[PDB]
C-alpha cells in the first residue's frame, strides 16, 4: 500500500479557477480485479426512485415523445417530455406512455357482444393490440362474457357479415380468472401453470377489475433492467413552464399520474420557481420534482431549501445553446457539475447534468465527476425513435433538431438554434452500446459500481490531470490521411 499520490485530486484541480470542460481534462486509471460485466451500474436521481442506467433524455420538443420514452425507459432508462404545446396533447402522450407495461390492468378497453368484427378491427387499427375482453354492458365494471385474442379474428372474410360477437368467442366456463385482492406472484404463477395467454381478474360478483397477459413476462426477461415502478409500470417524467397556466398544465397530468416532473427554466433562481415548488409540495407531497437551471452553489442552496429533491445543472452548455454569445451567463459545465454536486451531496440530493456531450466518454467521466446521473440530449437525437422524420440534404439521411428556446417557438430575443444531425439507428442497438461504454470506463477505473466511483473521488483516491491544446488535438485521431469513425 505504498501508492504514490501522483496526479491531481478534484478540489485541487478545480480551485485553479479555470473553465474546465470535458475536453480538457482526463481521468487516471487504477487497479482492476474483475471483468466489465461484473460491474453494477445502478444510479438514482431523487430520494426515492433509482435507475439501473444513469442516462435520461432531455425534454426538448423535437427530440422526445412517446417513442423515446417507452423505448429508453424500457431499457432501464427514463425519459422526460417537453411542454411545447397544449396540455391535453401532452396529457395524451403521458397517458399512452403510462401504459405499454402495466401491473394488474385497470380500465382496458372492453366491449359488448352486439358489436361486429369490423368494430374490433377499427379498435385495433387505432390500438395495435387486440387481446380484447368482452362484457355484457361494454363497461369496465361489468359482468364477464368471454375473451378474444388475436388467434380469433385473423381468418375471416366476414368482418360484419352478421358478425355479432356472440356466436364467435370462447364460452366462459372453461376460462379461469383470479379472485381480486391478490398479488402478482401467485397471479403470474397460476397464469404460467394455467398456460393460456391472458388472465382476467373478477370478484365473487363476477365484476371485472383486472387482467394480465403474457407480455409482462417477455418484456421482463427481454429487458432485465427496465425501470419498473412499484406497480411495475415504467417510469415517466415531463417538463413544464412557469407562466400561470402551468398549474393547469400540471394538474391534469397529476390526474394522469406522472411519476416525476422537471421544472424547466432558462435559469432557476427565481421567486417564481420556489413559489411554484411550494405550490407543488403542499398539493403533492407524494410527487417529486427536479430543479434548474442552476450552475453555482448559491442558486443551488436557495433551490434545495425550498425542498426540491433533484437538480438539472448546466446552462450555456448544450449543443444548441448560444446564451453565452447573446446573454453572457452560465459557465463551463464541467466546472459547474463538480461544485454543485459537492454542494448537493451535503443534502443527499442527486444531480443530473446536461449539455455538450459528444460521446460515452463525456458522460462517463461526467458522472464520475460527481454527477449522479446525466441527461444527454443531442447524442440520442435523430434516431428512428425520434419525433419528426428522416429527410435529406446534400445526399445524407438526416433529421432536424432545434433548441427549445429558439425564435422558432411560435417583441422578443432568441437564444436557441435550429439545425439537424445524422441518423444513429435504433436505440435498442444504441444505448446498450452506451452502457457497455460506461462499464468499460468504470472497469478501467476499477469499481464494481458507480457510487464508489463518486466516493472514490470524494476520497480523492484516484487522481485527475489537466490537458492542453496539444493534448486534445492529439486526443482523437491525428497524423493520418483518411480514416473512418465507427463507434460499434
Amino acid at each position: 500500500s505504498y501508492v504514490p499520490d501522483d496526479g491531481l485530486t478534484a478540489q485541487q484541480l478545480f480551485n485553479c479557477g479555470d473553465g474546465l470542460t470535458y475536453n480538457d481534462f482526463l481521468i487516471l486509471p487504477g487497479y482492476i480485479d474483475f471483468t466489465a460485466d461484473q460491474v453494477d451500474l445502478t444510479s438514482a436521481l431523487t430520494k426515492k426512485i433509482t435507475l439501473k442506467t444513469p442516462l435520461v433524455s432531455s425534454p426538448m420538443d423535437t427530440v422526445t415523445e412517446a417513442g423515446m420514452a417507452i423505448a429508453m425507459a424500457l431499457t432501464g432508462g427514463i425519459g422526460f417530455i417537453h411542454h411545447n404545446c397544449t396540455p391535453e396533447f401532452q396529457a395524451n402522450e403521458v397517458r399512452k406512455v403510462k401504459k405499454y407495461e402495466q401491473g394488474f390492468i385497470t380500465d382496458p378497453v372492453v366491449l359488448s357482444p352486439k358489436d361486429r368484427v369490423r368494430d374490433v378491427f377499427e379498435a385495433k387499427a387505432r390500438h395495435g393490440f387486440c387481446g380484447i375482453p368482452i362484457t355484457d354492458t361494454g363497461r369496465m365494471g361489468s359482468r364477464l362474457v368471454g375473451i378474444i385474442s388475436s388467434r380469433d379474428i385473423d381468418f375471416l372474410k366476414e368482418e360484419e357479415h352478421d358478425c355479432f360477437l356472440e356466436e364467435i368467442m370462447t364460452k366462459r366456463e372453461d376460462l379461469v380468472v383470479a379472485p381480486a385482492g391478490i398479488t402478482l406472484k401467485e397471479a403470474n404463477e397460476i397464469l404460467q401453470r394455467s398456460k393460456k395467454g391472458k388472465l382476467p381478474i373478477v370478484n365473487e360478483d363476477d365484476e371485472l377489475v383486472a387482467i394480465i397477459a403474457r407480455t409482462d413476462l417477455k418484456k421482463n426477461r427481454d429487458y432485465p433492467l427496465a425501470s419498473k415502478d412499484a406497480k411495475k409500470q415504467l417510469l415517466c417524467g415531463a417538463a413544464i413552464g412557469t407562466h400561470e397556466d402551468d398549474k393547469y398544465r400540471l394538474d391534469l397530468l397529476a390526474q394522469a399520474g406522472v411519476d416525476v416532473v422537471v421544472l424547466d427554466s432558462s435559469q432557476g433562481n427565481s421567486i417564481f420557481q420556489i413559489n411554484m415548488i411550494k405550490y407543488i409540495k403542499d398539493k403533492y407531497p407524494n410527487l417529486q420534482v427536479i430543479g434548474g437551471n442552476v450552475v453555482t452553489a448559491a442558486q443551488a442552496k436557495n433551490l434545495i431549501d425550498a425542498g426540491v429533491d433533484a437538480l438539472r445543472v448546466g446552462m450555456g452548455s448544450g449543443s444548441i445553446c448560444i446564451t453565452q454569445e447573446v446573454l453572457a451567463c452560465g459557465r463551463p459545465q464541467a466546472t459547474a457539475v463538480y461544485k454543485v454536486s459537492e454542494y448537493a451531496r451535503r443534502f443527499g440530493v442527486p444531480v443530473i447534468a446536461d449539455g455538450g456531450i459528444q460521446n460515452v466518454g463525456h458522460i462517463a467521466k461526467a458522472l464520475a465527476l460527481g454527477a449522479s446521473t446525466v441527461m444527454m440530449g443531442s447524442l440520442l437525437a435523430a434516431t428512428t425513435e425520434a419525433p419528426g422524420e428522416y429527410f435529406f440534404s446534400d445526399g445524407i439521411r438526416l433529421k432536424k433538431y432545434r433548441g427549445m428556446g429558439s425564435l422558432d417557438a411560435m417583441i422578443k430575443v432568441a437564444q436557441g438554434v435550429s439545425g439537424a444531425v445524422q441518423d444513429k439507428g435504433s436505440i435498442h442497438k444504441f444505448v446498450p452500446y452506451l452502457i457497455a461504454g460506461i462499464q468499460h470506463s468504470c472497469q478501467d477505473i476499477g469499481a464494481k459500481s458507480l457510487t464508489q466511483v463518486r466516493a472514490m473521488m470524494y476520497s480523492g483516491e484516484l487522481k485527475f490531470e489537466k490537458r492542453t491544446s496539444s493534448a486534445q488535438v492529439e486526443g482523437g485521431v491525428h497524423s493520418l490521411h483518411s480514416y473512418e469513425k465507427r463507434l460499434f
Binding site: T42, S43, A44, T46, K47, K48, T50, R345, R346, G348, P350, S372, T451, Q452, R454, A455, Y458, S459
Partner: peptide
C-alpha cells in the same frame, strides 16, 4: 436509500 446510492457512509466530511 439514494444517499447510500450516491456516496454512502462519509456523506459530507468537510
Amino acid at each position: 436509500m439514494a444517499d447510500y446510492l450516491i456516496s454512502g457512509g462519509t456523506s459530507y466530511v468537510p
